[PDB]
């Protein structure tokens, strides 16, 4: 049908995958461009369709800015162009607690695709005020109950390792990647997309 593979690696599985991008000034404009490029490389190595891999892209500061929903029926090349054009916020704070609440109540409020795995790829560079973490474990526990796998990727020395370890504790498929900087994302990309692809089923209809 519509649009052939760009690379030899091509994940043809039943997967709802959500990209959550740290919008804080812990990343420079140039470092944020590197993060989006990683997101666009990932997207090019997936079979994007309502039948195969669904993608969502959210940028988070003290609130969530959704650019693509799982259900947005558009051309892969259109979706990838949108992801490449996500704006730099350079915000004071990036709230893991807020973007996980958004993912729980706004993206995964109901499970359309019980046949699919569901993955939150939480791309973290920063540490939220301790006043904003009141309900953090609650929302991660709410995602574990909706069968959403949370994969925290800590980027850089300011990423909150306490929270990454906490997320891993709350459930066993919740598995973390700890990176020294954005430049490591491209090193780590093939291992990461292979790991994400293997957590998903090949058409179990």
């Amino acid at each position: 049908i519509s649009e052939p593979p760009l690379h030899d690696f091509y994940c043809s599985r039943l997967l709802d995958l959500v990209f959550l991008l740290d919008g804080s000034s812990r990343l420079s404009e140039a470092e944020f461009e590197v993060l989006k490029a990683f997101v666009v490389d990932m997207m090019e190595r997936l079979r994007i369709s309502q039948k195969w891999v669904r993608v969502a892209v959210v940028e988070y500061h003290d609130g969530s800015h959704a650019y693509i929903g799982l259900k947005d029926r558009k051309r892969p090349s259109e979706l990838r162009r949108i992801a490449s054009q996500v704006k730099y916020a350079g915000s004071q704070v990036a709230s893991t607690s807020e973007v996980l609440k958004y993912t729980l109540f706004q993206i995964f409020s109901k499970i359309d695709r019980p046949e699919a795995s569901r993955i939150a790829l939480l791309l973290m560079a920063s540490q939220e005020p301790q006043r904003m973490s009141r309900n953090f474990v609650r929302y991660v526990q709410g995602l574990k109950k909706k069968k959403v796998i949370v994969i925290p990727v800590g980027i850089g020395p300011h990423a909150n390792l306490k929270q990454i370890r906490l997320i891993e504790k709350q459930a066993p498929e919740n598995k973390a990647f700890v990176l020294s900087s954005v430049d490591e994302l491209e090193q780590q990309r093939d291992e990461i997309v292979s790991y994400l692809c293997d957590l998903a089923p090949e058409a179990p209809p």
Partner: nanobody
Amino acid sequence: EVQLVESGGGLVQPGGSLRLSCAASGRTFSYNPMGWFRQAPGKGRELVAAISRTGGSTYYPDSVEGRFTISRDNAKRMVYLQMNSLRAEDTAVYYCAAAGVRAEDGRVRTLPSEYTFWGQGTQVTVSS
């Protein structure tokens, strides 16, 4: 899961030319790495040509380098075997196959056990 249909076989003069086509269909088809195998009278299945998912990489045994070009067109879900300067020993049934082991990795596959889906076969006879 994956259905493969070969066409375009027949009789040719030695030193003649022939293009084989394979039409791939089905829900689970994901532009898998493909391979052309043959069974000649009294002989096992031989891999003669293999191609990555994108077509950027190819494998042929040294025995047949220069006589076979495998290619593919992913828009049409086709794979091809261009046969050139044909010999007596190239008489055989030619099978189109697809790798179903770890399909997500579209690199060229040489191990025959990684080929999982198989067509019905097309006869090529090189004679007078």
